[PDB]
Amino acid sequence: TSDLIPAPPLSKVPLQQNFQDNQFQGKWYVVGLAGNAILREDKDPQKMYATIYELKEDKSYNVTSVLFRKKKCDYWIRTFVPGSQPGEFTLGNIKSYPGLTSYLVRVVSTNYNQHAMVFFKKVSQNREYFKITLYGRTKELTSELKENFIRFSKSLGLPENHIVFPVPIDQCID
Ligand SMILES: COC(=O)[C@H](COC=O)NC(=O)c1cccc(O)c1O
Ligand SMILES: [Pu+4]
């Protein structure tokens, strides 16, 4: 049993015009995170983590997320393969994730050198999940950018308790 806010139609999710794959590379901090399986937890608030994008020769990204958990740095590695238009991706080797039948990434907006918003949708054990990340090249972003992220998240049907701003840390992600 679970109950989820439905994924929005893709028509409600903009795509960054003229996406530049080379400029999107490098480290991004997760300054904001929202989704139908994301919940604000005041007892142990979510810690900031980072995601590093590297273009391979074949123009897919190697994507590495690094998180501080149980006193250690944990690394999650995957491959984003260019999809139907620039700024969209599917997940490489999807078969090695049990139960995962669908995975889509769309870069919603970015100026490359400070901030981005990225939309993700997956189907896992037949359940449809989605999330939006607010990425920063630094660990803080302006109020304006955070409010825009909240506005965008709500437009996709998410209430405030499904929107979190992970707390900056120094372990692992420096
Ligand atoms: C069982 O709960 C989950 O499935 C987790 C929740 O935490 C996400 O960081 N993932 C997602 O909700 C999710 C959604 C879209 C794309 C992804 O890669 C995700 O991990
Ligand atoms: Pu995931």
Short mmCIF file of C-alpha atoms and ligand atoms in Angstrom, two decimals:
data_model
loop_
_atom_site.label_atom_id
_atom_site.label_comp_id
_atom_site.label_asym_id
_atom_site.label_seq_id
_atom_site.Cartn_x
_atom_site.Cartn_y
_atom_site.Cartn_z
CA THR A 1 0.00 0.00 0.00
CA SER A 2 1.04 3.50 -0.86
CA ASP A 3 -0.68 6.64 -2.07
CA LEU A 4 1.15 9.14 -4.23
CA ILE A 5 0.46 12.53 -5.73
CA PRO A 6 0.19 11.84 -9.47
CA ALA A 7 3.10 12.77 -11.75
CA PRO A 8 2.28 15.88 -13.74
CA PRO A 9 1.82 15.67 -17.48
CA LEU A 10 5.06 16.47 -19.28
CA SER A 11 3.33 19.46 -20.83
CA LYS A 12 3.62 21.17 -17.42
CA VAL A 13 7.37 20.64 -17.30
CA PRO A 14 9.38 23.15 -19.31
CA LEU A 15 12.60 22.28 -21.11
CA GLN A 16 15.65 24.58 -20.99
CA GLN A 17 15.97 26.06 -24.50
CA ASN A 18 19.26 25.56 -26.34
CA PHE A 19 20.66 23.17 -23.73
CA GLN A 20 24.49 23.07 -23.60
CA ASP A 21 25.69 19.68 -22.44
CA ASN A 22 29.30 20.69 -21.93
CA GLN A 23 28.41 23.71 -19.71
CA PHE A 24 26.14 21.63 -17.49
CA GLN A 25 29.05 19.43 -16.42
CA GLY A 26 30.76 19.50 -13.01
CA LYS A 27 29.48 19.58 -9.43
CA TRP A 28 26.03 20.77 -8.41
CA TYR A 29 24.77 21.01 -4.86
CA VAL A 30 21.21 19.92 -4.06
CA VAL A 31 19.89 23.12 -2.50
CA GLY A 32 16.22 22.19 -2.87
CA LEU A 33 14.42 18.89 -3.33
CA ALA A 34 10.71 18.21 -3.96
CA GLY A 35 8.65 15.21 -5.06
CA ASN A 36 5.80 12.86 -4.42
CA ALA A 37 7.95 10.63 -2.21
CA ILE A 38 9.86 13.49 -0.53
CA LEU A 39 8.65 14.47 2.94
CA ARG A 40 9.87 17.21 5.27
CA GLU A 41 11.19 15.54 8.45
CA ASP A 42 11.87 17.90 11.34
CA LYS A 43 13.41 15.21 13.61
CA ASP A 44 16.36 14.47 11.26
CA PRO A 45 16.32 17.11 8.47
CA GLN A 46 17.72 16.12 5.10
CA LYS A 47 21.44 16.88 4.64
CA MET A 48 22.70 18.50 1.48
CA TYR A 49 24.32 16.23 -1.05
CA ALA A 50 26.00 16.79 -4.35
CA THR A 51 25.75 15.42 -7.88
CA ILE A 52 28.58 15.55 -10.39
CA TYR A 53 27.93 15.41 -14.13
CA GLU A 54 30.69 14.34 -16.51
CA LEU A 55 30.34 14.10 -20.28
CA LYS A 56 31.78 10.96 -21.78
CA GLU A 57 33.26 10.85 -25.30
CA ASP A 58 29.96 9.42 -26.53
CA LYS A 59 28.03 12.37 -25.04
CA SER A 60 26.20 10.51 -22.30
CA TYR A 61 26.81 11.72 -18.73
CA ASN A 62 28.43 9.78 -15.97
CA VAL A 63 26.44 11.01 -12.97
CA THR A 64 27.77 10.57 -9.45
CA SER A 65 25.86 11.56 -6.34
CA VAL A 66 27.70 11.82 -3.06
CA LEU A 67 25.95 11.79 0.30
CA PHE A 68 27.11 11.79 3.91
CA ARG A 69 25.36 8.94 5.70
CA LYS A 70 26.24 6.98 8.83
CA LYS A 71 29.52 8.87 9.19
CA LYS A 72 30.66 7.93 5.67
CA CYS A 73 30.57 9.16 2.09
CA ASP A 74 28.22 7.07 -0.06
CA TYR A 75 28.47 7.27 -3.82
CA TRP A 76 25.60 6.55 -6.29
CA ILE A 77 26.70 6.21 -9.92
CA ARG A 78 24.60 6.16 -13.03
CA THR A 79 24.49 7.08 -16.72
CA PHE A 80 22.17 9.63 -18.32
CA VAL A 81 21.73 8.95 -22.08
CA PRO A 82 20.61 11.82 -24.37
CA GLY A 83 16.89 11.53 -25.05
CA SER A 84 14.40 12.87 -27.54
CA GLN A 85 15.64 16.46 -27.35
CA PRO A 86 18.55 18.42 -25.93
CA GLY A 87 18.28 18.59 -22.15
CA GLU A 88 16.35 15.33 -21.81
CA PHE A 89 17.87 12.00 -20.76
CA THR A 90 16.99 8.40 -20.10
CA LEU A 91 18.84 6.10 -17.71
CA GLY A 92 21.59 3.80 -19.01
CA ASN A 93 21.51 0.04 -18.14
CA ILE A 94 18.09 0.34 -16.58
CA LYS A 95 18.03 -3.48 -16.25
CA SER A 96 20.41 -3.42 -13.28
CA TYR A 97 17.80 -1.64 -11.16
CA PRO A 98 15.23 -4.24 -10.15
CA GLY A 99 11.65 -3.14 -10.77
CA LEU A 100 12.57 -0.01 -12.68
CA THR A 101 10.70 0.15 -16.01
CA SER A 102 10.88 3.84 -16.84
CA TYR A 103 13.19 6.79 -16.08
CA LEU A 104 13.20 10.31 -17.54
CA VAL A 105 15.26 13.43 -16.85
CA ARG A 106 14.39 16.89 -18.16
CA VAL A 107 16.49 19.98 -17.44
CA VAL A 108 13.84 22.60 -16.76
CA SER A 109 16.03 25.69 -16.43
CA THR A 110 19.67 26.64 -15.82
CA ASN A 111 22.22 29.38 -16.27
CA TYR A 112 25.00 26.77 -15.98
CA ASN A 113 27.29 28.73 -13.64
CA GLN A 114 24.96 29.23 -10.63
CA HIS A 115 21.65 27.36 -10.68
CA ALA A 116 19.46 24.72 -12.33
CA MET A 117 16.12 22.97 -11.87
CA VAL A 118 15.82 19.42 -13.07
CA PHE A 119 12.73 17.20 -13.26
CA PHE A 120 12.92 13.43 -12.86
CA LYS A 121 10.19 10.83 -13.33
CA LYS A 122 10.46 7.11 -12.83
CA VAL A 123 8.24 4.03 -12.68
CA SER A 124 9.42 1.55 -10.03
CA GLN A 125 7.44 -1.56 -9.07
CA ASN A 126 4.67 -0.02 -11.20
CA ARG A 127 4.53 3.12 -9.03
CA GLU A 128 5.09 6.48 -10.65
CA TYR A 129 7.46 8.78 -8.75
CA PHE A 130 8.66 12.25 -9.60
CA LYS A 131 11.03 14.76 -8.10
CA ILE A 132 12.45 18.20 -8.84
CA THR A 133 15.92 19.26 -7.77
CA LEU A 134 17.10 22.77 -7.34
CA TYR A 135 20.83 22.68 -8.06
CA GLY A 136 23.33 25.36 -7.05
CA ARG A 137 27.01 25.66 -7.94
CA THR A 138 27.29 26.97 -4.38
CA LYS A 139 25.54 25.70 -1.26
CA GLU A 140 23.36 28.79 -0.88
CA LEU A 141 21.03 30.38 -3.37
CA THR A 142 18.96 33.57 -3.30
CA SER A 143 15.49 33.73 -1.84
CA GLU A 144 14.18 34.57 -5.28
CA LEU A 145 15.50 31.30 -6.73
CA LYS A 146 14.17 29.28 -3.80
CA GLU A 147 10.71 30.87 -4.07
CA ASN A 148 10.69 30.15 -7.79
CA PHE A 149 11.47 26.50 -7.02
CA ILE A 150 8.63 26.39 -4.47
CA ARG A 151 6.26 27.97 -7.02
CA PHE A 152 7.29 25.49 -9.69
CA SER A 153 6.93 22.52 -7.31
CA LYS A 154 3.42 23.61 -6.28
CA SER A 155 2.43 24.01 -9.94
CA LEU A 156 3.17 20.30 -10.33
CA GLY A 157 0.74 19.49 -7.51
CA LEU A 158 3.16 19.25 -4.57
CA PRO A 159 2.25 20.77 -1.19
CA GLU A 160 4.78 22.47 1.06
CA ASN A 161 5.51 19.43 3.18
CA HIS A 162 6.84 17.72 0.02
CA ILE A 163 9.39 20.45 -0.55
CA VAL A 164 12.67 20.43 1.40
CA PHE A 165 15.82 22.53 1.52
CA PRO A 166 18.66 20.27 2.53
CA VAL A 167 20.95 21.68 5.20
CA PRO A 168 24.47 22.62 3.97
CA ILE A 169 27.26 20.39 5.31
CA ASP A 170 31.00 20.11 4.69
CA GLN A 171 31.58 16.33 4.80
CA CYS A 172 31.90 14.52 1.45
CA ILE A 173 30.50 17.20 -0.76
CA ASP A 174 33.42 19.55 -0.68
C1 LIG B 1 10.92 5.03 -2.20
O1 LIG B 1 11.18 6.41 -2.48
C2 LIG B 1 11.93 6.78 -3.68
O2 LIG B 1 11.69 6.15 -4.69
C3 LIG B 1 12.97 7.89 -3.67
C4 LIG B 1 12.72 8.97 -2.62
O3 LIG B 1 13.91 9.74 -2.40
C5 LIG B 1 14.52 10.47 -3.50
O4 LIG B 1 15.59 11.05 -3.34
N1 LIG B 1 13.19 8.46 -5.00
C6 LIG B 1 12.34 9.20 -5.74
O5 LIG B 1 11.23 9.58 -5.39
C7 LIG B 1 12.77 9.52 -7.13
C8 LIG B 1 11.88 10.09 -8.02
C9 LIG B 1 12.29 10.35 -9.29
C10 LIG B 1 13.59 10.04 -9.72
C11 LIG B 1 14.48 9.45 -8.83
O6 LIG B 1 15.74 9.13 -9.23
C12 LIG B 1 14.06 9.19 -7.55
O7 LIG B 1 14.90 8.58 -6.69
PU PU B 2 17.01 7.71 -7.63
#
